[PDB]
A paper describes a structure:
The M-Lip domain of mouse lipin 1 and lipin 2 formed a symmetric or near symmetric dimer in all three crystal forms with a root mean square deviation for all atoms ranging between 0.36–0.77 Å. The observation of near identical dimers in three different crystal structures strongly suggested the native quaternary structure of the M-Lip domain as dimeric. Notably, the residues involved in dimerization were highly conserved among human and mouse lipin 1, lipin 2, and lipin 3 paralogs. Lastly, our data suggest that the conserved dimer interface of the M-Lip may contribute to both homo and hetero-dimerization of mammalian lipins.
Lipins are magnesium-dependent phosphatidic acid phosphatases (PAPs) that catalyze the dephosphorylation of the membrane lipid phosphatidic acid (PA) to produce diacylglycerol (DAG). Phospholipid synthesis and fat storage as triglycerides are regulated by lipin phosphatidic acid phosphatases (PAPs), whose enzymatic PAP function requires association with cellular membranes.
Numbering used by the authors:
A (entry chain B): 462 to 475, 480 to 547
B (entry chain A): 462 to 475, 480 to 545
The structure:
Amino acid sequence: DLPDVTLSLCGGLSISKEKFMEHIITYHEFAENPGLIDNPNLVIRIYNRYYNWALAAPMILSLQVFQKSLPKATVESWVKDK
Amino acid sequence: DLPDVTLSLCGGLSISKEKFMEHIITYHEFAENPGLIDNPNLVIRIYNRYYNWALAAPMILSLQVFQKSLPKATVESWVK
Ligand SMILES: [Ca+2]
Ligand SMILES: [Ca+2]
């Protein structure tokens, strides 16, 4: 089954798990303010790691479009680039 | 039954079915260049409509995180 994705406004990339779950974004919060997608404090939990939106967006998009993760070698080069 | 999402480098968002299908991005093409997400010609097909990456990003994110589409009033106010 496909990986879970979790959103939190915890910041800190510029991260403990207590920090992450204290600021988790609900559906209702996102549905009332989609502009949070540009919030630099937005953190994405996927693959047991923490990413900002600019690093997680391809992985999110690949899962929604092809229902398949980006290859592990692909994720490494996308991240070591940035 | 969540909405289908299709990618295409068809551009021209400033669209024919023919031009969209001709430049549909496969998994291998995206896996070889994730930078396509910032390509100005990237077109997203969802809800029988065409969006660039900027408008389509929250819709796809809410489908991935909450497995539920954004509210129609929200998508409409977000796309305004
Ligand atoms: Ca919250
Ligand atoms: Ca193609």
